[PDB]
Amino acid sequence: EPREEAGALGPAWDESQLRSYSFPTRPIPRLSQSDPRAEELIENEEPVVLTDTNLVYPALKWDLEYLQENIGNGDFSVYSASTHKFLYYDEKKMANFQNFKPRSNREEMKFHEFVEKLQDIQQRGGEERLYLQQTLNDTVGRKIVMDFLGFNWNWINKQQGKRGWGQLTSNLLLIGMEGNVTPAHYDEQQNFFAQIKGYKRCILFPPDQFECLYPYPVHHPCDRQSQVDFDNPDYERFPNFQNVVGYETVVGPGDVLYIPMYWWHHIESLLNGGITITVNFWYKGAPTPKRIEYPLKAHQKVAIMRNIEKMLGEALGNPQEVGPLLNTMIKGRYN
Amino acid sequence: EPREEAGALGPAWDESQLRSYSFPTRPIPRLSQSDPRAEELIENEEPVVLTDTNLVYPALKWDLEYLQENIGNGDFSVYSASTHKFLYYDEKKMANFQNFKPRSNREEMKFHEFVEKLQDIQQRGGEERLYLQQTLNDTVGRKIVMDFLGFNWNWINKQQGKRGWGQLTSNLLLIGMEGNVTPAHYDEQQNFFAQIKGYKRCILFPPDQFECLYPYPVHHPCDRQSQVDFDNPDYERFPNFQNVVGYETVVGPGDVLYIPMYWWHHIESLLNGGITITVNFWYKGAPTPKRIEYPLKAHQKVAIMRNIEKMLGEALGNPQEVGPLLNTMIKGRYN
Numbered sequence A, B: 001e002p003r004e005e006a007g008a009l010g011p012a013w014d015e016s017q018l019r020s021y022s023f024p025t026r027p028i029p030r031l032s033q034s035d036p037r038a039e040e041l042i043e044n045e046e047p048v049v050l051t052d053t054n055l056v057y058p059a060l061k062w063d064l065e066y067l068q069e070n071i072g073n074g075d076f077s078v079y080s081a082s083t084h085k086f087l088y089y090d091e092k093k094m095a096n097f098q099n100f101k102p103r104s105n106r107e108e109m110k111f112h113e114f115v116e117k118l119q120d121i122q123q124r125g126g127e128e129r130l131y132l133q134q135t136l137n138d139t140v141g142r143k144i145v146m147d148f149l150g151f152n153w154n155w156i157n158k159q160q161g162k163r164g165w166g167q168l169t170s171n172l173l174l175i176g177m178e179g180n181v182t183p184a185h186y187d188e189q190q191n192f193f194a195q196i197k198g199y200k201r202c203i204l205f206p207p208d209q210f211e212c213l214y215p216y217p218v219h220h221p222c223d224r225q226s227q228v229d230f231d232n233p234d235y236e237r238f239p240n241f242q243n244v245v246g247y248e249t250v251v252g253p254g255d256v257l258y259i260p261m262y263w264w265h266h267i268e269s270l271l272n273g274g275i276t277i278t279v280n281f282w283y284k285g286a287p288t289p290k291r292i293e294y295p296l297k298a299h300q301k302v303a304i305m306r307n308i309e310k311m312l313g314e315a316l317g318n319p320q321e322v323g324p325l326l327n328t329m330i331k332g333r334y335n
Ligand SMILES: [O][C]C1=C([N+2](=O)=O)[C]=C(C2=NOC(C3=[C]N=C(C(=O)[N][C]C([O])=O)C([O])=[C]3)=[C]2)[C]=[C]1
Pocket: A133, A169, A170, A172, A174, A182, A187, A189, A193, A200, A265, A267, A268, A278, A280, A282
């Protein structure tokens, strides 16, 4: 249901820019930040697209040319992938899984090198894909600092206070190539996803879909990522992926998506849609109330499972024995 | 390989008194307490039958007539079972499993009532089976106190000190009917099993046979007992019971069996062999050394599994959700 750009500029996107998947989806509500329904969704830990926060308004003019001049000469972390899927891996956990071979590489370089490398790929017509991820701090140039200070800190700080969240833990500038895919994963923090340039399709799954999405072992370098290849799902290894249902939206410049903590998200930059720019705001979650409500939420059950996997790895002295012990505990007893 | 009683009194037992099972066994060593091999077995947490401890020497004269006179008028806990299998259940845990129906009953009665009830069953030729289990304390009569004080406390106290064990946690007098079976289970304490009257076949399994013996969930009333019916094993529910190998011995009057903590034991009173009397000594285990050796023993892995089941039940607020969460953690991730 592509929205129409103002001034009769045509549809913002067409469906042929969206990749094809096996599961059904329904739309995330697009609302005004003044609408009480938006506040109710955020308070209830459910996603919403806010259309008028002005959260990153001064950055709406950002593009590669403007950024290259004013971001200054600093090292920016650039990730590379041969396929459209970008596979992040925790280097610290690579020791436990010696047979793991990384499929993405990170290279620190200046902004001009990133722009030239991106243009070079297009000039060659190649299939190498790139992804820049860098924190918005004082190291950037003065003009970017002015834009950064111009974010709607009043709106987001009030959101932090009202929801009882913790501290702003990270702020990442995010520049990607058309067709790039960040595969399904979850984060342990609250996120506001502020779209700046281009369009990104965001597909979210509630925390109770844990059984349908098959995350890696906690000690694996791909911890918190789904094991299921969304392009070629292995229903024999992952039967419950046949039951997964998602919440889908396409975010464009000016939109902010609240991704609640522990919610799975799959994010792709629209095919043939140009480069994308996003700024992400992550906040530590609110502390658990000491008065535990025993129904118990899915995200709390996820936290329990993570803690058990972590404790078991420490107690056995080797995270690779977690699986055999768990199977010993369950087979013929709980299954 | 039935031993011959002294004075040409014939074989102590014949094989037709031993029940038939599906698994193979090998013999537990029968040794003198002065033999260094016996000390090495106890120190290494392996079973041994000691033939000459004199641990319960003054009780070797005990029988039903002598006990009835001198034990005095007190209440003794008598357990009843319709079948030869005695199913102990933890009454405290019965709340968690409402669908559990107990198969044994406990009734407090005086010693004369126990003797008459036992004789009554034989007079009727009935199939009701009975089992008396009572602590050796000051409540018993003066003559039983003299016998109790006459146990080889010097030998057993030295064993407690040498092995670093904790305190004598329980001392149970154990009187049963011929054919009685205590099904396979494990205890979390060190045990000396002092046979007094009649013969008992003891079948022990090392702690690493956990996977072949399928204990109940920790929160189940039958916690620490094997789910496998040794008389009719369900190989579909319990495939690894086809791999179980045990250590077997027949203990008679004067023998003491060390049952190391966490070792599975199945104990039966020989068919057509008369009543049996045993006194059990349980000691708390030695504290774990702070210098953990990372190979890690099977009994330590059992303790870890028990702790995880207990913690999970508390965290979820309902022990019946332990199974579904464990399966959620494992399916498609560790299995
Ligand atoms: O505990 C502090 C803390 C820190 N820290 O140390 O400051 C860093 C992180 C963090 N590290 O990485 C990400 C991340 C997550 N998700 C995405 C994503 O989903 N991108 C798709 C798209 O299109 O937006 C991402 O790009 C980065 C977050 C989290 C917590």
